[PDB]
Symmetry: C3
Subunit: 283 residues, 3 copies
């Protein structure tokens, strides 16, 4: 098995730099149905994962898996087109290697979107949540993404996550929403990581409310932890597909079809917002 170590990440970065002359300082990972911005990257290069030395094998799951480099708003970026999720069975080492390759390529800021369920009673379908902290049930339970030997070249044995979600990036995101008069859609909140792939049950939703969670989803926290470990700043935004607490009270259900319809409804606005965030990131 391929470890997410310094030598293996260096070999992948070497291949990438040879194929493209882009030196990116921003990385992006987009949620399901929320990837249209990647198709609008300028002067771009598309690199299938399967072609990159030491990238994880993704043919069992199938579907798209490419690294895309180019320019947005005059800024140099790298995007993952086809996110890796831990409910698919990928190991800690497979999730971590692409983020550590980003670090070696020069990435200093990582922007992430996801689809999530609403727990807080003020959250409605179609709302956005700026993530300010998390509750990591896999990590408490011996499935943290950093379980294994520490790769000292990237970061410390025992990371502190108290500043994992950069405050100034949350402030910039909100400012742009206010300039475009959609701030009434924008909240902040704590994200619960449900390993998945089943949606949280009605009684799990009720438990998460008691525990101070605002939203629940099946992604994001592994990549945030690998980024924080190696000194990359993070902004993470959830798009709310439903309120799981209301659905429990009324005996109705979420499904993946309903999730994807909400994604389609907010895709173009999210694309515009993130384009402007990228343009406005401090120098």
């Amino acid at each position: 098995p391929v470890v997410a170590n310094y030598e293996n990440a260096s070999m992948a970065a070497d291949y990438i730099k040879r194929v493209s002359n882009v030196l990116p300082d921003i990385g992006i990972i987009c949620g399901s149905g929320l990837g249209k911005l990647i198709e609008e990257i300028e002067e771009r290069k598309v690199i299938p994962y399967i072609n990159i030395p030491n990238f994880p094998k993704t043919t069992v799951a199938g579907h798209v898996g490419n690294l895309v480099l180019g320019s947005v708003g005059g800024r140099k970026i790298v995007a993952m087109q086809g996110r890796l999720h831990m409910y698919e069975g990928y190991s800690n080492q497979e999730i971590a290697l692409p983020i550590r390759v980003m670090k070696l390529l020069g990435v200093r800021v990582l922007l992430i979107t996801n689809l999530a369920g609403g727990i807080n009673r003020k959250l409605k379908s179609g709302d956005f949540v700026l993530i300010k902290g998390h509750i990591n049930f896999p990590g408490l339970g011996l499935n943290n993404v950093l379980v294994g030997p520490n790769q000292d070249e990237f970061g410390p044995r025992f990371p502190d996550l108290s500043n994992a979600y950069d405050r100034l990036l949350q402030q910039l995101a909100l400012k742009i929403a206010q300039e475009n008069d959609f701030q009434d859609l924008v909240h902040e909140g704590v994200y619960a990581f449900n390993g998945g792939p089943t949606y949280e049950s009605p009684d799990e939703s009720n438990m998460l409310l008691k525990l101070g969670c605002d939203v629940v989803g099946m992604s994001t926290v592994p990549e945030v932890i690998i980024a924080c470990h190696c000194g990359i700043k993070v902004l993470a935004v959830s798009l709310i597909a439903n309120n799981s607490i209301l659905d429990a009270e009324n005996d109705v259900s979420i499904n993946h079809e309903k999730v994807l319809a909400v994604a389609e409804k907010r895709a173009d606005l999210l694309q515009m917002w993130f384009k402007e965030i990228i343009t406005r990131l401090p120098l």
Copy 2:
């Protein structure tokens, strides 16, 4: 390792159909000490797991492991004699394959019993609990039974569990208890899945009370999830061995000997109840 896929499940079903001419539409999985009904199946065929292509290897744990097919109350059934538990070290694929074989054989309803600890203060040793929902600590923590590639022939990538415990089956079970005047023993409640094999500690019991759990046990939820994923209806009933909250307050303990004595005390009544449930299942 043998994946719980369509081809592997089909090969096991083929062997079973050749050895027996029973086309079952009901499946049963019985808790420890609660298996006497299996010995009373009519015109029956006993098939050791070890003889069935692609069934999981169970010789390290030892003890009984047979699939039993025959008739109860004029209805065609298949039973697992010797349940597989995840605390023994079985993988997701090993737990799932027997349930997916049931699906291919024709099973539409799965009836399950277990032994559990009482958390809700109205529960006493010897009571029965109709399970109406669950809190899946392994699933929140990246050990859900569906972690891995999705087997699309059986079900969707992201299942909804809100109707995993069929309401009409709970109603039929209660009606039969009322007809036989043992309804004062019958409650409903939320089941917490403790991966095990240690009993939950006194402080874990107190935590589960705060979180809205009514009972706690080490089985059932993996099989419920595999069944729900592939469209099989479920009734699950816990037999209460003790009240863990009272034991914590009084500084006394449960053990496996005490559990088995409670099983013996309620075995014959549970056998009669489930015989009638099977007979009365809607056509």
Copy 3:
């Protein structure tokens, strides 16, 4: 892979008994920075793990790994110099084998120290907590140290943990603190096991307060469970590095450097305390 079974543990014990003539009835496992007592064991023998048949391989992590046998206060002891932690990726079998070797060598009492974060509001940096119970998030979530086949020669399939932390040993520890006038530093409390290696996040700290936890750490509970399973009595003491709830309210952070500085501040007192505990253990 080497299973923590009776034959494999017996082969390791044989080697140890040949190299040393010490028959220990006390075992010790010391927290990071808290190992000075081991360097003061009398008439001692140091045995590198790498030399002992069937001991787990520890070269990937590196750092010290020795078993040390000798006398303290006239009592015969065995110490682990270099603790194994589950966040390093060691399996259940690797953690359990050294404790089962202790059992075969004659150990009846196991004394443990660790470094932990404070959750209860009465806990300050530099305080000691006598552990009276635990909340085992890995165990609830299918990562209990006993997941796997049961090794029947050592203990039962389903252990009861209600008396895992011996009450009389807690009383002796407190009595010695009172004799030396440092009882104002000594509390009792419930320990939450965070699998690690990230420190619990600010929002995880707030959750643990709601759930009745007094301290949080990344060790101890696996060894306690293996010891309880095979009938070894346990005293476990946490040294508090910080109050995570105050740090969350004030937006400040713990780190490993700060932890180690607290260890240095209390090391000599902890060494004196444990020397006297060992001397005073009942015959």
